[PDB]
Design a protein around this ligand. Structure first.
Ligand SMILES: Cn1ccc(-c2cn(C)c(=O)c3cn(C[C@H]4CCN(Cc5ccccc5)C4)nc23)n1
Length: 126
């Protein structure tokens, strides 16, 4: 297909924990970004077939998106907050790798990244 299988949202072996920080990442951080007017291109895996982007998965080998992150949080997939933060960060840098710098999709990502940094600056102490 052009589309790879989507990133997993569960795993038989990967260990997990629940923490107040992971709860905050779902209830506050993911929620705040998800409701933003510019969230919609980031709420699901890039569908290269639908969007006609034959080069996307030639370039992006570690895809990530907030739909996957939301499911990972809901499924208790993460061991700690750092693992979840890493997924957000991958989502943003993938956008900057793939896209032309002046593209509106990059402007959208940048607005969401600025909000994300504000929210992570208030990550509660564990
Ligand atoms: C559902 N959906 C629509 C677009 C995407 C999308 C998501 N991600 C993460 C991306 O990194 C995308 C890259 N594209 C192609 C750009 C070329 C012209 N731009 C034009 C453009 C600008 C602003 C918004 C949409 C399209 C879009 N499209 C995407 N997902």
């Amino acid at each position: 297909s052009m589309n790879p299988p989507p990133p997993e949202t569960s795993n038989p072996n990967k260990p997990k924990r629940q923490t107040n920080q992971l709860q905050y990442l779902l209830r506050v951080v993911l929620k705040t970004l998800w409701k933003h007017q510019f969230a919609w291109p980031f709420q699901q895996p890039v569908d290269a077939v639908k969007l006609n982007l034959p080069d996307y998965y030639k370039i992006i080998k570690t895809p990530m998106d907030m739909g996957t992150i939301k499911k990972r949080l809901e499924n208790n997939y993460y061991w700690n907050a750092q693992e979840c933060i890493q997924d957000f960060n991958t989502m943003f840098t993938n956008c900057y790798i793939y896209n032309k710098p002046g593209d509106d999709i990059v402007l959208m990502a940048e607005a969401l990244e600025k909000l994300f940094l504000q929210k992570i600056n208030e990550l509660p102490t564990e």
